[PDB]
C-alpha cells in the first residue's frame, strides 16, 4: 500500500509512477511511505 502525507505528495508520487518507476525511488523524492497491508495512520 502506498500512504502520502499530503494531497500533493499524493499527485507527486502518482506523477513519479507514470513511466513505471521504482515505487521506492518516488516514495523517497514524495514522503510517501510504502507499507505492507493496506492501514494508513493520522497522516
Not at 521504482?22 to 497522516?43: F, H, K, M, R, S
Amino acid at each position: 500500500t502506498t500512504c502520502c502525507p499530503s494531497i500533493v505528495a499524493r499527485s507527486n508520487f502518482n506523477v513519479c509512477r507514470l513511466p513505471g518507476t521504482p515505487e521506492a525511488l518516488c516514495a523517497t523524492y514524495t514522503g510517501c511511505i510504502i507499507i505492507p497491508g493496506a492501514t494508513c495512520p493520522g497522516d
